[PDB]
Write a protein that binds this ligand. Structure first.
Ligand SMILES: CC(=O)N[C@@H]1[C@@H](O)[C@H](O)[C@@H](CO)O[C@H]1O
Length: 306
């Protein structure tokens, strides 16, 4: 009867779980992206409306019976973005508790099931977020696909295209990415990449998918692809170092986990990142996420209920 909503506005999808107050997940719903930095406000509003309404339709209950809603989404970086997202949910007619956080905060909650720890995201975007034993939080990275997202899938896809073009026009080292990217995208020639990137409405998720090609080429022995993966791991490590030092956790026991289909999928990248952490922070323990981010959002919403 009573339920909560938890929404993960990740870089790959929007993922909503509806749960009872004793954490029995009743249903989940998937829609497209919800980042106001890469879609119009009307586009995002529509996504969240369609997402919530499809779940309520399966649930058979109205929104005003919902005890709390938590949404962690990419693009919720500033207090001003928090209130914009809150407004698109209130516009549905909800007057209960709404908690809007960055997608890294719900990944922390789902991954560690506590408030204290470190989370690195590398999916279509990248970010590090942490909270120390004193309850103080900090973040690094997360500045988006133009002025940030170092070590994200989007960043690896752009760098893969750049390395393939430099291989083609003779400014860089030869790499099998030169032909492999064209095969993957079903393009005849490198000039076709101009239509693909600038003319066709390409999405961040589409560019980030080229991380699959880099991983494949690394397995085939390609040195350029291997160095792209290594440098992304270093960028991700730098974001942890930044948060660890800001929160004065350099020499404290810390639990760290990771989210996103780039850091969690590519063995070499994950290994290099773990190596950097192990070199620098003896007391950081690395674990896998206990639940997913949408269940983290359920934890944050339900924890606000009596
Ligand atoms: C769009 C922006 O400025 N920053 C987002 C950030 O909110 C998010 O935490 C991160 C990982 O999903 O992706 C970045 O692109």
């Amino acid at each position: 009867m009573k339920y909560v909503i938890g929404i993960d506005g990740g870089g790959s999808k929007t993922h909503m779980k509806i749960s009872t107050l004793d954490y029995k997940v009743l249903l989940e719903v998937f829609k497209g992206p919800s980042n106001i930095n890469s879609s119009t406000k009307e586009e995002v509003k529509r996504v969240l409306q369609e997402l919530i309404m499809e779940g309520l339709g399966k649930l058979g209950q109205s929104l005003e019976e919902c005890s709390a809603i938590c949404i962690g989404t990419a693009g919720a970086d500033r207090t001003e973005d928090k209130s914009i997202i809150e407004d698109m949910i209130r516009s549905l007619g909800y007057m209960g508790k709404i908690i809007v956080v960055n997608d890294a905060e719900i990944a922390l909650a789902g991954g560690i099931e506590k408030r204290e720890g470190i989370i690195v995201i590398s999916g279509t975007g990248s970010i590090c977020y942490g909270r120390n034993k004193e309850g103080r939080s900090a973040r690094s990275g997360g500045w988006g696909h133009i002025i940030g997202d170092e070590g994200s899938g989007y960043d690896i896809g752009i760098k893969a295209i750049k390395a393939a073009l430099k291989s083609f026009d003779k400014r860089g080292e030869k790499t099998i990415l030169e032909g492999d990217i064209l095969d993957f995208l079903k393009l005849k020639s490198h000039e076709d990449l101009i239509n693909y990137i600038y003319r066709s409405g390409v999405t961040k998720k589409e560019i980030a998918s080229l991380t699959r090609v880099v991983n494949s080429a690394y397995i085939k022995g390609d040195l350029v692809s291997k160095r792209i993966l290594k440098e992304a791991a270093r960028e991700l490590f730098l974001s942890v170092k930044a948060v660890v030092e800001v929160l004065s956790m350099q020499n404290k026991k810390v639990v760290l986990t990771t989210a996103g289909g780039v850091i969690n999928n590519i063995n070499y990248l994950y290994d290099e990142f773990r190596k950097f952490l192990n070199l620098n922070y003896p007391k950081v323990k690395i674990i896998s996420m206990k639940n997913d981010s949408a269940f983290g959002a359920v934890i944050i919403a339900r924890s606000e209920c009596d």
